Amino acid sequence: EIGTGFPFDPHYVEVLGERMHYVDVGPRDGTPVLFLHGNPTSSYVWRNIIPHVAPTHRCIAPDLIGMGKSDKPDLGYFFDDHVRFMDAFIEALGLEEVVLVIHDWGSALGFHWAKRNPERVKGIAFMEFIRPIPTWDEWPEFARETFQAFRTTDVGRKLIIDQNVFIEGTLPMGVVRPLTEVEMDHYREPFLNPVDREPLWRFPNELPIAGEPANIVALVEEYMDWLHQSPVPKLLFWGTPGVLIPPAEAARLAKSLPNCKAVDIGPGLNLLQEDNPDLIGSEIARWLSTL
C-alpha cells in the first residue's frame, strides 16, 4: 500500500506579496524538518514520508511559488525567484535551526540556503538532487532526447507549456511503478491552465548540463564544494538506475562527502519517494533520532 490521500490542513503565509501554501504537522517545539519538493511536484510528493517523521519532529513542507497550492504570480520563475521566495518563507515562519529533507530542485534551494546559513542547518537528507552534469552522456539515455528538446527556445515551450509533457509524460517516467490516475490528478491540479506552466519549463532550462546556464553551474558548483567540506550530518537516498544520481555517483558521494550515510531504496528513477516511501521515511526517522 502506498497512499494517495493528502490529509494535511492548509497553512498559508504571505511572502513577497504572495501567499505560499505549506504543510505543518508534528510537535511545535524542537528542531523543525523542512521538506522541499522540486519539478514538477509539490508537498504531495512527501505525503507518505511525513507520517514517519511527525511523531517526533515538526514537519514543514511548503509548495514552491508557482506550484502546488501556492499562488501563481506571473513571473519568469528563474531559479533566483525561487531562492528569494524560499528565503522569505523561511524568515516569515521564524525558523532558526532546521533539518533539510530535499529533492530535485528543492535540493538546489536547500543546499544553496545551507551554504549561506551553515550554522542553522543541523542535518541534510537528500535524494536525486541537482549536481553539475558536465556532459549529456551523464544524463540517462532513455531521457536525453526529451530533456534536450525541453531546453530549446520554441520546441521546449510547445512541449511543456502547450502540451503539458512534463506532467503527462516526464513525471510518470520518473517513477518505476505506475502512477495511478488519482495520484496523477493531484500532480495535474496546479497546472490545468497553460498560463500556469512557466515554472515547469524554466526548471529544466536551469539544469546545469554541459556548462549551461553558466550562472546555475556556478551556483551548484559553489554548494557542492561547501557540501564536500561541511561536517553536517548527511543522508543520501538513491535508487537503480536513478536519473540525476546514478548508483556509481551515489557510491562516490558516500565516500567523498563527510559524515554521509547512503541508503539504497531499490528500483528508482527520480521521484524516489513514490517508489519506496516506507524505507525513506523510516530511515529519516532513525537518522533523526541519532543526530
Amino acid of residue 110:
G
Closer to ligand ILJ by Cβ: residue 26 or 275: 275
Binding flag, residue 208, ligand ILJ (CB under 6 A): no
CA angle 70/283/290 to nearest 5° reads 105
C-alpha grid cell for residue 22? 505549506
Closer to ligand ILJ by Cβ: residue 8 or 166: 166
- Burial class from Cβ neighbours inside 10 Å (0-12, 13-18, 19+) for residue 91 reads exposed
Query: Locate cell 549551461: which residue?
Result: 212
CB of 175 to Cl ion, least distance (A): 15
CB of 210 to ligand ILJ, least distance (A): 16
Structural element, H or E, at residue 272: helix 272-275
C-alpha grid cell for residue 185? 490528478
Binding flag, residue 176, ligand ILJ (CB under 6 A): no
Amino acid of residue 250:
A
Binding flag, residue 233, ligand ILJ (CB under 6 A): no
Closer to ligand ILJ by Cβ: residue 159 or 161: 159
In contact, 88 and 73? CB cutoff 8 Å: no
Q: Which of residues 237-276 bind ligand ILJ (CB under 6 A)?
A: 243-244, 270
CA 161 to chain centre: 21
Binding flag, residue 41, Cl ion (CB under 5 A): no
Candidate list 156, 174, 190, 242; residue touching ligand ILJ; CB under 6 A: 174
Binding flag, residue 36, ligand ILJ (CB under 6 A): no
Q: Which residues contact 172 (CB under 8 A, 6 or more apart)?
A: 178, 179, 184
Q: At how many degrees (to 10) do helices 79-92 and 105-116 cross?
A: 60
Candidate list 203, 223, 237, 238; residue touching Cl ion; CB under 5 A: 203
Candidate list 26, 51, 102, 104; residue touching ligand ILJ; CB under 6 A: 104
Site residues (CB under 5 A) for Cl ion? 39, 203-204
Residues binding ligand ILJ (CB under 6 A)? 38-39, 104-105, 143, 146, 159, 163, 165, 168-170, 172-174, 243-244, 270
